[PDB]
Write a protein that binds this ligand. Structure first.
Ligand SMILES: [Fe+3]
Length: 54
């Protein structure tokens, strides 16, 4: 699965880690994160995130 980055504050969502404190378990693909989830650091929504392609 791919890593996504918050383009506002640079936080990186890593699907291996998830975001367990806010209910996103390890192994969750970004597309499957509930759409009301917000960046843990700057609180912007998913629509300001982009795939980390390489
Ligand atoms: Fe952010």
């Amino acid at each position: 699965m791919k890593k996504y980055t918050c383009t506002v504050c640079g936080y990186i969502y890593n699907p291996e880690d998830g975001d367990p404190d806010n209910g996103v378990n390890p192994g969750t693909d970004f597309k499957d994160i509930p759409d009301d989830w917000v960046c843990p650091l700057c609180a912007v929504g998913k629509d300001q995130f982009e795939e980390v392609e390489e």
